[PDB]
Symmetry: D4
Subunit: 128 residues, 8 copies
Amino acid sequence: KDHLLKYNVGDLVWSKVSGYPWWPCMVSADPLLHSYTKLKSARQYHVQFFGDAPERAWIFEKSLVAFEGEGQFEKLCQESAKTKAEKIKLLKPISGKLRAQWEMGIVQAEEAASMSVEERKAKFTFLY
Amino acid sequence: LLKYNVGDLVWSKVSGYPWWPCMVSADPLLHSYTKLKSARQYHVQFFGDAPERAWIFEKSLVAFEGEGQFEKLCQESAKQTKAEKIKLLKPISGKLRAQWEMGIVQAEEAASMSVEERKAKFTFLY
Amino acid sequence: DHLLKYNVGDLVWSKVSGYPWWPCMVSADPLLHSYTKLKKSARQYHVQFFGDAPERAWIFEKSLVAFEGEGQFEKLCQESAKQATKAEKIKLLKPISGKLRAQWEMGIVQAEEAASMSVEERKAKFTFLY
Amino acid sequence: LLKYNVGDLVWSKVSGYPWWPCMVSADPLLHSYTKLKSARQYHVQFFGDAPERAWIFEKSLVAFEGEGQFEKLCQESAKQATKAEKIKLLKPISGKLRAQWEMGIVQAEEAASMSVEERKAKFTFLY
Amino acid sequence: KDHLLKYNVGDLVWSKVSGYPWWPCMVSADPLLHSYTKLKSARQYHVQFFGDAPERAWIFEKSLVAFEGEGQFEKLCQESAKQAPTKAEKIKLLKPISGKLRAQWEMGIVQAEEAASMSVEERKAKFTFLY
Amino acid sequence: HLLKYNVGDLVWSKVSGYPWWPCMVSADPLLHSYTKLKGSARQYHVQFFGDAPERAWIFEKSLVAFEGEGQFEKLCQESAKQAKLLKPISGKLRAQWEMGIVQAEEAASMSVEERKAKFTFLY
Amino acid sequence: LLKYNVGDLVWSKVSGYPWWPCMVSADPLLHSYTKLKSARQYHVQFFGDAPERAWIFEKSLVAFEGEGQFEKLCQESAAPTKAEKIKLLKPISGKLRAQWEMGIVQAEEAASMSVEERKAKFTFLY
Amino acid sequence: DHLLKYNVGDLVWSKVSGYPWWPCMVSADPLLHSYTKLKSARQYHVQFFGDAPERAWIFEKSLVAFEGEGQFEKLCQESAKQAKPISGKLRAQWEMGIVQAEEAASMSVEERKAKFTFLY
Ligand SMILES: O=C1COc2cc(C(=O)N(Cc3cccs3)C3CC3)ccc2N1
Ligand SMILES: O=C1COc2cc(C(=O)N(Cc3cccs3)C3CC3)ccc2N1
Ligand SMILES: O=C1COc2cc(C(=O)N(Cc3cccs3)C3CC3)ccc2N1
Ligand SMILES: O=C1COc2cc(C(=O)N(Cc3cccs3)C3CC3)ccc2N1
Ligand SMILES: O=C1COc2cc(C(=O)N(Cc3cccs3)C3CC3)ccc2N1
Ligand SMILES: O=C1COc2cc(C(=O)N(Cc3cccs3)C3CC3)ccc2N1
Ligand SMILES: O=C1COc2cc(C(=O)N(Cc3cccs3)C3CC3)ccc2N1
Ligand SMILES: O=C1COc2cc(C(=O)N(Cc3cccs3)C3CC3)ccc2N1
């Protein structure tokens, strides 16, 4: 039973990886391990990072926030900012290649959000 | 409120072919798994070493439990044209028998799994 | 391009001897990169056959009809049968079965979804990779 | 009544990169080639041996004619730029990036010698 | 663990499928199920059919013969025709292959003989068909 | 210097039950050779041109250098005299044969190096 | 008489990287899994979501039992150079920590399998 | 083709600014289908050998016929006089290239084209 977890396959989330901005993702099954959640005492979910160069990872629930839209990003940065060096880095706006790919991810996540979970699973699940 | 959902294992009947082990899946292009053609259809994937897919009517689908169902499925389809009946009861041979067998082995391995895991393992890429 | 009857992305029905009128999309040859040619004296267009098992060919304009929807198929069969050899007519009127019926149906579903789209969007969604 | 269409060859400017030869294309997933963010963007593919793609603002696009435009593009982007930004913009590309930029230019010039339909059939990167 | 069976992954065998000639094969793991042998009371092995259009199947041990070379094929046909109780089956079994199937059978033999000239490890790395 | 054909050469190939088909001499994707001796009698690895490409090891006796489509009629008439063969191809096979001819004629208009880079089917 | 064979799980040390979960494999082009350079090397595949491969010296390989070995591997590797030691003891972060973690998860799942099954499941396609 | 210094399948060392002399093979552009061009100065399209293959159009002046690994030391010393040993990921991939190039060198041009031409 999946009806008992906070997130399920196809759910849109923001993921935080140290040294990267909060990123638009979808919860998905590991292409090899075929699981989407696991315990490490602490729950993790397998996610896919939206964009033109897709990546994937096992991210802790503590580092996930349900995706509603782009408007959440500012508060996510301000809350994550609140190490002295880490704060100055977190508040700084993204540039170059990473800004383009982050933008590409948001466009994909917002398109995915306008869909039922089944359709977005069939359209946005990245093949590996 | 639908009889089947993505990941459900079914037997599908296509005229001129034996009842085949399948899984209900989303269409790779249309991203839907069910549609109305007044009469409901489901998109399915045919299990085997040479996978295929199709939009099959609900009337031509039966929930998959295991291989043991096949004999009754043949006998019921045969009872439901004199030439059609003799063809339906005849056991499969050669390439088709091997691929049918391969499908059953895949479907039974899929059946031993939770729906989420079987979707992640057995959904054929297109 | 604005001077030819058909262009890349246009939906057409194609007739190949021994097959039913099939839902297609005019497309560029994956290798030759042309979508129309003269065989020049007679014009041909490269088409992709819609379905779960996609195929492609260079089809003569005489064997192409602009696709509007499934409702045209009956008249296409009846007109092709009247134009046809006594054996050819009986074959043309006979309804498709098995694997071919399923794939023809799959093509129709794809063609009708493609028809509900702007040419640019349908080229980006329905052009089969080769 | 839009400035660019699918298959049009453009130069794109991405912060930290030289003006790059591109072709306007449809997003492989979203199937659109232009969108509004009040400000118009176009989906482009970056030419070269390691292809990439992005949604670039119209203000950061210039119609591609040939390699000869690049010098003026650098000099105009430098004049429009922060003292540090100008010194960086005028500096010539080297190593892997110079090779890939060169590869893109060769592809873009070969694409330019073709009718829009033929270049779409040959140079649209598969994703 | 895998030291007790007649065949192992990478072993070259001839496989008999009803309606087809004895075909050059390699024993291999199922690309999805990751097993190379199973019991159905009767043992089966997963094989890949050599040729330009590769295929795969689960074949019963009774329908497998260790591959030494092309020279075995004549005796295999001869033994198959003698074991076939049906008169029609025998005439079919002795008939030589033609067209596309003859070419692909030939292609398989060429691949199998190349594979035979290699150590098991090397032939697994070169001839295992990707799926 | 003694072989009639080399990688990239355009040939017509005859396979029993099929019309003379537009081909190109190529290396085997696995065996990496383009010619061999079966036994006494030389074979060449070829790739059949068309929208559904295939490949095979064909005997030299079943190969004829490709110049163009105009050769096909004489090839049929000569194969018929040496022997169904005279009957014209239809349906799917006629379309794919036509597709092969179009590919072979485009390949013929190119230098050997360019045609190897463009028309060698990936496997 | 070789220490490792195709399918064996090992930890590999590449200068500037943490000890990484690998599996011994045949080179996809050269079809060999071990060679001499005098000194023996093995072809390995680095486990993770972004797989890589390399020819690694036997001296830089340690048989993989599980994640619990990593701490002692770091402490033993921690190097005559003073700068090298401080770098080696420092814990991995960001993208590399995620991919290292992904590799461990894959290596531990591979370890729970018979050599034949793990070669069929975890040999990365090239 | 019989008139140029290099042809498709020939093994060469390539020099790209900021990289060590790298074991390569002359090949046709997967898109442009040419293997040499003039830019007054001749270039050849090459593929860099290794586990992560790359390709580029390199000037003839930056190419040297590949005989074996033993040439590398002199190539560095000559390139330094005209103007540090490789480590980590790059050292491994360079090593992987040498192994591939030396295997390719032991083969006839035809066979090495069929085995070592990287698909794109
Ligand atoms: O198009 C895209 C989508 O994915 C990206 C991930 C990354 C990216 O590097 N990461 C970190 C990773 C952890 C595990 C693997 S990758 C994620 C942002 C946090 C960078 C650029 C990307 N571009
Ligand atoms: O490995 C496999 C799995 O799929 C098959 C389908 C078929 C097969 O031909 N069909 C009919 C089809 C209808 C739509 C497309 S395909 C299905 C059995 C009913 C034949 C062999 C197969 N082998
Ligand atoms: O999914 C599909 C779509 O394409 C098909 C083509 C055919 C099919 O065979 N044809 C004939 C062809 C012309 C040249 C190559 S293929 C077309 C119907 C006219 C059969 C089944 C198909 N199923
Ligand atoms: O062969 C190529 C073509 O594309 C490249 C893009 C880049 C490259 O990194 N960029 C920035 C990007 C923004 C969005 C995704 S990529 C483009 C130059 C501006 C670097 C090298 C490349 N090499
Ligand atoms: O290149 C090849 C190799 O494989 C083939 C298998 C077949 C072929 O059809 N078979 C029967 C099969 C059973 C299971 C799947 S396929 C095998 C010969 C017995 C036909 C042609 C082939 N050509
Ligand atoms: O597009 C194409 C090209 O290749 C074909 C080969 C065949 C085809 O079946 N053959 C026979 C073969 C022998 C070895 C493998 S294939 C060749 C014509 C003689 C049929 C249709 C094709 N369509
Ligand atoms: O998912 C993964 C798995 O492989 C990686 C290798 C590397 C990685 O860069 N290396 C060094 C290499 C040497 C030869 C080629 S790659 C290995 C860790 C030592 C970095 C990140 C990875 N992420
Ligand atoms: O496996 C490999 C082979 O190719 C490489 C190229 C490079 C590499 O970056 N280059 C520079 C390039 C110029 C054009 C595109 S790439 C070449 C060494 C000079 C780095 C690592 C590699 N690893």
